[PDB]
Amino acid sequence: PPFDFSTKYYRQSSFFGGTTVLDQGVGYAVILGFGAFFAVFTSFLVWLEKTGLIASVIVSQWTWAATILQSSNVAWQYGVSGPFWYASGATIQVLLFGVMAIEIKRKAPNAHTVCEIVKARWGTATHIVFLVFCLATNVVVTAMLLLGGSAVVNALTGVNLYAASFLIPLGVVVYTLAGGLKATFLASYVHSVIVHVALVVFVFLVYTSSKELGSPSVVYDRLKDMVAKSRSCTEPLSHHGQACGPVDGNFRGSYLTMLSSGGAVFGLINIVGNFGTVFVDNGYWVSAIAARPSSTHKGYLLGGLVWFAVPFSLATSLGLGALALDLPISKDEADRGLVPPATAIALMGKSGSLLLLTMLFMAVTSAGSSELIAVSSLFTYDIYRTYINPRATGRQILKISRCAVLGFGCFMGILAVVLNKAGVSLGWMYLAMGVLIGSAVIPIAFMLLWSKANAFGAILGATSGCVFGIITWLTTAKTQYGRVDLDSTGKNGPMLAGNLVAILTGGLIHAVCSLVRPQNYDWSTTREIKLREEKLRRAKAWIVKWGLVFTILIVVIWPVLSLPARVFSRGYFWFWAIVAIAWGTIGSIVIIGLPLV
Numbered sequence: 001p002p003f004d005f006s007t008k009y010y011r012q013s014s015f016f017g018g019t020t021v022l023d024q025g026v027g028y029a030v031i032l033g034f035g036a037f038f039a040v041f042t043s044f045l046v047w048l049e050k051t052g053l054i055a056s057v058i059v060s061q062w063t064w065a066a067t068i069l070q071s072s073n074v075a076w077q078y079g080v081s082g083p084f085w086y087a088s089g090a091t092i093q094v095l096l097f098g099v100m101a102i103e104i105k106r107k108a109p110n111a112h113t114v115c116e117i118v119k120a121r122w123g124t125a126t127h128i129v130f131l132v133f134c135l136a137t138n139v140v141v142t143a144m145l146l147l148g149g150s151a152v153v154n155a156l157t158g159v160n161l162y163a164a165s166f167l168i169p170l171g172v173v174v175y176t177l178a179g180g181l182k183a184t185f186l187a188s189y190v191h192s193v194i195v196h197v198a199l200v201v202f203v204f205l206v207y208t209s210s211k212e213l214g215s216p217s218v219v220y221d222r223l224k225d226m227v228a229k230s231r232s233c234t235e236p237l238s239h240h241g242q243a244c245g246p247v248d249g250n251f252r253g254s255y256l257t258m259l260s261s262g263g264a265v266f267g268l269i270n271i272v273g274n275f276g277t278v279f280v281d282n283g284y285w286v287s288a289i290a291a292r293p294s295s296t297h298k299g300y301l302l303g304g305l306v307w308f309a310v311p312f313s314l315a316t317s318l319g320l321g322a323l324a325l326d327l328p329i330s331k332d333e334a335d336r337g338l339v340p341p342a343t344a345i346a347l348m349g350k351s352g353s354l355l356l357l358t359m360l361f362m363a364v365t366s367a368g369s370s371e372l373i374a375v376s377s378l379f380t381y382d383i384y385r386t387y388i389n390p391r392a393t394g395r396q397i398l399k400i401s402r403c404a405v406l407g408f409g410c411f412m413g414i415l416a417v418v419l420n421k422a423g424v425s426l427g428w429m430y431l432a433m434g435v436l437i438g439s440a441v442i443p444i445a446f447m448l449l450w451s452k453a454n455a456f457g458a459i460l461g462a463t464s465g466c467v468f469g470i471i472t473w474l475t476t477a478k479t480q481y482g483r484v485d486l487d488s489t490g491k492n493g494p495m496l497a498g499n500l501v502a503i504l505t506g507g508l509i510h511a512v513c514s515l516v517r518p519q520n521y522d523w524s525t526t527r528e529i530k531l532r533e534e535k536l537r538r539a540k541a542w543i544v545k546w547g548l549v550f551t552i553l554i555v556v557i558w559p560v561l562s563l564p565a566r567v568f569s570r571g572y573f574w575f576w577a578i579v580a581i582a583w584g585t586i587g588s589i590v591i592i593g594l595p596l597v
């Protein structure tokens, strides 16, 4: 027993190895009745219904299953810089959302999907090409929240892993088929309130009230004893990946430092992934066509500032508390998204597990309902109406919309079962998003903004970038290691190479083939899809001016100013923790109380 506070674990190769905290009945109830319960609740909310609400709406559509599970994964590694580099992809989102919402009103105000603009601007061959890159994004993104949720449910309640994978989408389908087609303005408020209450409780548990970890001076003392050079991590005391001894790639092998190379590489990958999530996902566009930016453009900045605090504070609390407690978490287990449940069980046994399950399944249901209504609209407006029957009455569009939801929900369950059998995990899929669909980001931006891009260059760049990125991503893994499998492929180097190659070459071919043969476009035909510009011109100016300042302040200046601190001292870590606590508390207070006022 090297440590006095972790004697009960002595050596253990894993945290979850039997004797589940809860029983299978709770797991089945959670994975079955959540959709019906909130459907009834939303029906009651609608019945009673008949810059603060907009912020609550923005926050509710940006919290996914990765915001909870993945942000603590890169905190168990790399120490202090992981949560920061994960949360830094928030100021870009508000700028992109504002620009997209402003520019859709002034060039295509009567559209439903992004692929309806591709057919209008360019021809038909490019419509099919980008219709495949849009469905792949939905397939990849939906498969990410079906792996983490199933893993967490199986870890906590002991329910069969292959039964949860198929039964999780059915609850979301039931929720979406009933009220939930954006429902009303109150469901977002309820979701945000629950999420922020859970966040506040978890943050305040580990730094103020817990008996095991009740001070920022205990976490500091325990984090610097794990990376001691006198520590032995041989076979009887530690296993291969188990967070023992100095951290490789960190200055002096410390968890308390901003000088981490792995964290910086992860942030570089995360930027490309966030770029790929905004332009290629049809749910973002669906949310951007229903916005009123000429009068309510100021809520997006508040929404982004409030959303910044969730992946930062939660990962700082639940991620650094697992290292300080000396839990036998393995690398494969931490990859799957099982870091927060372990800390919740260790610190708040049998009561924090239910709270974390509720917080996770709120996001799972909210995000899966949006993914289901990004493909039913795609199918019903870009395939059925355009090619199979181009003369359709309303009663015949509502049947197709309802059938597409069932079809996608039933297909994704089988896909999730297959992926769980094959051993794929969240975190491997999170990093690989930009390699696959990163080549169609710049063509779509050119379609929305640039007036010289043409059809042929778009197809050429989109098709070439994916192939080149995949080739580079596989060849780097083959060259730098001895094999091509799920272990060597999911590393920072190959993933960074694939991401950069995929994103960069798709915007260079399109920008070269268009400067030779420009297609001067006035967006006349996109405005005919089946004052006022002064306000839209003053909203865009405000968004551009006030969105860049915070992006520069957060993504650039703040990490630069923290490098001279080298290894954090007791007094700088106090400030670092107090910043997170204050940010989380103030954001929760603003988003819970102000909309009432």
Ligand SMILES: CC(C)CCC[C@@H](C)[C@H]1CC[C@H]2[C@@H]3CC=C4C[C@@H](OC(=O)CCC(=O)O)CC[C@]4(C)[C@H]3CC[C@]12C
Pocket: 261, 264, 265, 267, 268, 271, 555
């Ligand atoms: C704005 C954010 C999201 C990205 C900014 C990009 C660059 C400013 C970063 C990203 C990756 C960083 C690199 C990651 C790893 C290293 C290795 C590092 O080498 C060492 O000192 C380790 C070698 C040893 O000591 O044995 C030198 C800095 C460098 C090149 C870093 C320099 C700064 C880089 C290029």
Ligand SMILES: CC(C)CCC[C@@H](C)[C@H]1CC[C@H]2[C@@H]3CC=C4C[C@@H](OC(=O)CCC(=O)O)CC[C@]4(C)[C@H]3CC[C@]12C
Pocket: 476, 480, 491, 492, 493, 494, 496, 497, 498, 500, 501, 504, 505, 508
């Ligand atoms: C084994 C891992 C954990 C560490 C060692 C891997 C990396 C340090 C190396 C391996 C291959 C390298 C990459 C090989 C090729 C490229 C493509 C290149 O991308 C371009 O800009 C392409 C040109 C363009 O199209 O504009 C940029 C450098 C990069 C990412 C290299 C960056 C450094 C990488 C990722």
Ligand SMILES: CC(C)CCC[C@@H](C)[C@H]1CC[C@H]2[C@@H]3CC=C4C[C@@H](OC(=O)CCC(=O)O)CC[C@]4(C)[C@H]3CC[C@]12C
Pocket: 560, 563, 564
């Ligand atoms: C645009 C140009 C003109 C200025 C850019 C400003 C910063 C990006 C530079 C200026 C001074 C740099 C610092 C100069 C010295 C160091 C000490 C250095 O510490 C060590 O690794 C040495 C300690 C040791 O190894 O014993 C860490 C980087 C840091 C903070 C540098 C980080 C980057 C800084 C802040």
Ligand SMILES: CC(C)CCC[C@@H](C)[C@H]1CC[C@H]2[C@@H]3CC=C4C[C@@H](OC(=O)CCC(=O)O)CC[C@]4(C)[C@H]3CC[C@]12C
Pocket: none
């Ligand atoms: C002996 C030498 C070769 C190495 C050791 C000296 C530096 C590493 C230290 C010593 C004093 C430090 C300075 C003490 C006070 C300031 C003022 C401070 O300036 C402000 O921004 C003031 C606030 C404002 O007016 O906006 C910025 C940090 C700085 C330059 C510090 C930067 C780091 C310095 C130069």
Ligand SMILES: CCCCCCCCCCCCCCCC
Pocket: 249, 250, 251, 252, 253, 258, 259, 260, 261, 264, 559, 560
């Ligand atoms: C002593 C063992 C090796 C230590 C290597 C530390 C390298 C840290 C470099 C990463 C710093 C990136 C800062 C980026 C800020 C924008």
Ligand SMILES: CCCCCCCCCCCCCC
Pocket: 259, 560
């Ligand atoms: C062994 C010590 C290595 C220290 C390397 C520090 C590198 C810092 C780079 C900062 C780049 C900032 C770009 C804006």
